Amino acid sequence: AMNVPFWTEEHVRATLPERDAESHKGTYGTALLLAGSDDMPGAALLAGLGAMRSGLGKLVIGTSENVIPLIVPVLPEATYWRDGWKKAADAQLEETYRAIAIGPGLPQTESVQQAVDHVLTADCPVILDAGALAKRTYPKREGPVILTPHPGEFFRMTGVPVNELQKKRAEYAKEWAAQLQTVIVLKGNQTVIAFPDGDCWLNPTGNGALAKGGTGDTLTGMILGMLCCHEDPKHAVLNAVYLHGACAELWTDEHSAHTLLAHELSDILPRVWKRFE
Amino acid sequence: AMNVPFWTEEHVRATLPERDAESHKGTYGTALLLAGSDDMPGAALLAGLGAMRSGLGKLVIGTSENVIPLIVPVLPEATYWRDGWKKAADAQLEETYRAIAIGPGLPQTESVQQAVDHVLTADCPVILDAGALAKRTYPKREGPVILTPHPGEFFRMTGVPVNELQKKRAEYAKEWAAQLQTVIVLKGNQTVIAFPDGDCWLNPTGNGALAKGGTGDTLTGMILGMLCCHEDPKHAVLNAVYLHGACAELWTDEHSAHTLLAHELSDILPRVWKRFE
Amino acid sequence: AMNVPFWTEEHVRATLPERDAESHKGTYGTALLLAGSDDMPGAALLAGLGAMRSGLGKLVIGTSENVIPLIVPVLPEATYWRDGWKKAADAQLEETYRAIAIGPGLPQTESVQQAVDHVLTADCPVILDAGALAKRTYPKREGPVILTPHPGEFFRMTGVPVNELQKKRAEYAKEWAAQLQTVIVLKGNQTVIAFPDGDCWLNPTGNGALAKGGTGDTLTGMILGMLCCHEDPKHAVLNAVYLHGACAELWTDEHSAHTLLAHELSDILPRVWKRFE
Amino acid sequence: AMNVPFWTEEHVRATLPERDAESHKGTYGTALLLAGSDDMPGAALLAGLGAMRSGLGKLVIGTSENVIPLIVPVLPEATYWRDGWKKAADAQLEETYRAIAIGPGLPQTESVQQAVDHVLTADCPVILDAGALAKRTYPKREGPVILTPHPGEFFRMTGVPVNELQKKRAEYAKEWAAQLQTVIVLKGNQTVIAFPDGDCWLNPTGNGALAKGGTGDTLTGMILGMLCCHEDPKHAVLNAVYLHGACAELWTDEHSAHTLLAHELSDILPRVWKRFE
């Protein structure tokens, strides 16, 4: 209705970064993932895999202590900040990260918002998802804040009912990205990527294979890794949302859309990304 | 002998659901799986994988606390109700599920029957398998109750000896589905699917590759997921039993029937289901 | 030197069992595996996988309590007898098994020999490997006892030094199978399969890819499963040793012999077994 | 600048060992890996997999107690020395190993240097990586000591700043290999392999896919295994560094360089090694 343009294959091709011969892991940065709780452990593995698949140099996972041994056998490349998401409620981050994500598998509590407030005092892009999404405002800071709500979470953030939101998705997403001064990735079919400077795009990829628990946690991870290897954080977000949907389209060529498990998106990404190089 | 018809490829094709572009995980519902105990943990992973492979939107696994970390690395998409099957003995379910299964890897105890009684007060289809199968009757309720006995369990439910049962499988299964007012999936070669309204079918798929521990737990999961994405719960049951057997037939094209492990049925299902679309 | 014949492809083909349409898991029996200790946990997973791959109906793994959660995510089809190998020191088996193996990953202690003595009072074939192999004699019983020593273990059982053994492998293996009234599978290149009735064969398959920790534990499992689905326990042993070696030969077609991991033998067996049907 | 020659395909082909029909696991030795701590567990799995993939006969992993259950499901072929890296601080090794590696996932502490001092009294090649790398000297002993620093660790060992090092990598690496009387594998694009007798080579393989956490831990493991199956420990080091890089090149044929996870190097090695036979 606002004629929001699609982020197309040609855009993805023009903006995906190289991984030069002369580079080292430090070139691609260290990401911090604050995710996974004893009651919701899976989200940390889904987001960790998404992140390490997506071009970072190193990943530190600040998960609950009992979740760590569940990640190690599947993702032995990750390192840990034991109970990191809880500790981040109490102090500003001492270390420097290229990018930070918070929320997948975390409860919707005040202590999580305290961790968000401490994360936001860092100078790097920050992603807020799932339990870190709430009705709130954001401090002026250097790097972008990127909110990744599904329509239910957007309702929790804004009070726009889901049935009203879904009639004018790009219009509400743009309005609230402007108001909050955050990036908003408004999930669903034709995901809207709304920037606080008024740029806005639609994502043309993806299908109903994604309409299952865990696919959003994978995307959060993919955005986190992409923020580390793209110079322009806008291109990171756009490319992550695009390639995420493209992995689901690859799956449905020879597999039923009913049967995808989110972690498989991360297994498919290596081949899908290569096609856009 | 009663000329029970086979649920054929043509029936499966005509009744398998679409997964539309405009859908979200809520369209495909949340399933609850009450399965897995410290002594029999594997059943929860087999049934969880079967369920998440089979078109649901979300899965909550109410397993014993010590079983949770065994599922997470393999199925990080699942969420948990810690000690759920035990807690369900004490109270009616507060939350609303699209479908519920109970019994795989649970002991044949009175406390399991108490959990069954509480599950049955929900308005959704309910599957009873393994430890939840007993000699008992069922309350009038809205949604179907689906019993999935092998012949030994059918003997425990009815007192019909296995050697007598196996001579007239469809006749006993129909009689008892009518008497109990439950669906009965009477397992084995040519599994019988008997509905309490007197409809009855035979399953034409499957082979001896399935004659090994865990394949029934996988099927229970597959029925649970299919109940979430089919409008007609009859078609869910029939399609689950059919596709389960078809995965074993795909396996035996290039692998010996002696060597299948149940969890591999769930890995094969994505490709097998696609063939029937 | 004694012109011991090779168990050939033609023998394997003529003796491998069918898995009939009308069968159920009970047709293929329940195996018991007494393996894996806190200090040597891996052996239980290697042998469990070998066994469930090899045509049994059900597997009960009597492993140490802390080893159970290490097996479940990889082999959720197995069931458990918690601390089974330890408990078997104290009482005769109450339950009936189709076949039993003891020793992989168990210490060479008197308590393990006490468990062996209790196992031998069952009427089924029994495999003794690794920690269950000692200098001892065997009681007259119904079913075969099958010892699976490498040359070092054969030295521990008999006092024949390894350097003397390796000069006349079939002659020593036959002599001691006769003396002990046990089957002896004397491992190595050209493994000798010596029966106490004086039959003896050489195994023609296998290569240096097998010369690495864990491949023997896999074989023990494979023999256990094969004992459950072959009518003739001699053919089970021979076919297990043969197919084990054939999986290593398949591997070396496209992979270096230096790089095989034992568990991969079990992943290869499905395709290799099919070729001999 | 010093015209250091490349270790080429032709060198690799001429020096990779055979795995003879008549061999047994004892022919290829037992390696000891002292790696992995509660805070950095993943390194033990990465290095263990690298080592068991690389032609050893047996592997003993001396890791922290809580790390053991994280390795077992992925690498059930490994055995353990519980808290081995800690215990090695207190006594000389009682057992004989073909080769030893220490440091991946260990803290940079004095107690780790005490374990290094005890390891060095063994007569076998010893690899020092990660936390075992420090500014220190080395005792005259029989077998080679092999240091595997990235440029940051080389700075910690020598005080040559990274920006100065990277201008004259081979010159600094040769000078310090001579001074310390250690092998130095100076990591990065065109990794330098400098021997204390003044031989020096460059590695021609590898790419930016390797510029991510965990790839060095995999290499340490690969060197450890290769030391066990090559007669000449120089050829082991060179071949390990070469094949490690070649696995990353195979990956990038059909997968994006951004998306490799280190453990996958070990999965690729079987096929890559075969190509050089």
Ligand SMILES: Nc1ncnc2c1ncn2[C@@H]1O[C@H](COP(=O)(O)OP(=O)(O)OP(=O)(O)OP(=O)(O)OP(=O)(O)OC[C@H]2O[C@@H](n3cnc4c(N)ncnc43)[C@H](O)[C@@H]2O)[C@@H](O)[C@H]1O
């Ligand atoms: N459209 C909608 N209408 C009404 N209510 C809605 C709604 N969408 C969500 N909700 C609400 O959300 C709640 C259910 O999710 P919820 O349980 O709240 O989130 P969670 O507990 O943290 O874990 P999840 O089960 O959600 O999975 P996820 O977080 O990994 O999925 P996500 O949505 O982030 O990520 C899913 C990912 O998959 C993509 N995706 C999903 N379906 C498609 C599709 N059909 N085509 C293309 N892409 C799709 C998304 O863009 C995204 O990237 C309910 O309360 C419900 O009301």
Ligand SMILES: Nc1ncnc2c1ncn2[C@@H]1O[C@H](COP(=O)(O)OP(=O)(O)OP(=O)(O)OP(=O)(O)OP(=O)(O)OC[C@H]2O[C@@H](n3cnc4c(N)ncnc43)[C@H](O)[C@@H]2O)[C@@H](O)[C@H]1O
């Ligand atoms: N036919 C029979 N005759 C006499 N006694 C019998 C019997 N079948 C079972 N029993 C009794 O059952 C007990 C053994 O099982 P049991 O131990 O009681 O069940 P469990 O402990 O909960 O776990 P399981 O080892 O049974 O495996 P499962 O539950 O995953 O298998 P299920 O049967 O549900 O699921 C197996 C699945 O595989 C399918 N399947 C099995 N074989 C074939 C085949 N040959 N062709 C096509 N489909 C097959 C089934 O239809 C089903 O979907 C014994 O006490 C025995 O007496």
Ligand SMILES: Nc1ncnc2c1ncn2[C@@H]1O[C@H](COP(=O)(O)OP(=O)(O)OP(=O)(O)OP(=O)(O)OP(=O)(O)OC[C@H]2O[C@@H](n3cnc4c(N)ncnc43)[C@H](O)[C@@H]2O)[C@@H](O)[C@H]1O
């Ligand atoms: N030939 C020999 N000469 C002198 N000493 C020897 C010896 N073989 C073994 N030893 C002794 O054995 C000890 C080392 O093993 P050991 O540590 O004692 O056994 P473990 O601790 O229980 O676990 P492992 O590391 O042995 O592996 P495994 O039990 O899974 O292997 P297995 O041998 O059962 O099973 C290995 C499997 O792989 C097969 N295999 C091995 N190499 C080949 C080959 N080259 N060609 C064909 N098949 C082969 C075998 O037939 C068998 O099926 C040493 O003390 C050593 O002295």
Ligand SMILES: Nc1ncnc2c1ncn2[C@@H]1O[C@H](COP(=O)(O)OP(=O)(O)OP(=O)(O)OP(=O)(O)OP(=O)(O)OC[C@H]2O[C@@H](n3cnc4c(N)ncnc43)[C@H](O)[C@@H]2O)[C@@H](O)[C@H]1O
């Ligand atoms: N070049 C550089 N310039 C400035 N500072 C540097 C630097 N390289 C490293 N650093 C320093 O190192 C620290 C970061 O690593 P660090 O965190 O200190 O090591 P760790 O905590 O023990 O675990 P890691 O995250 O390092 O991964 P790894 O040990 O498995 O990787 P490794 O380097 O051993 O092994 C990596 C492996 O991949 C190979 N590899 C990496 N990139 C390429 C490439 N582009 N082409 C070919 N091979 C490559 C290497 O040769 C090696 O085999 C920082 O403090 C940083 O200052």
Ligand SMILES: [Mg+2]
């Ligand atoms: Mg979400």
Ligand SMILES: [Mg+2]
């Ligand atoms: Mg069952």
Ligand SMILES: [Mg+2]
């Ligand atoms: Mg052995």
Ligand SMILES: [Mg+2]
């Ligand atoms: Mg390193």
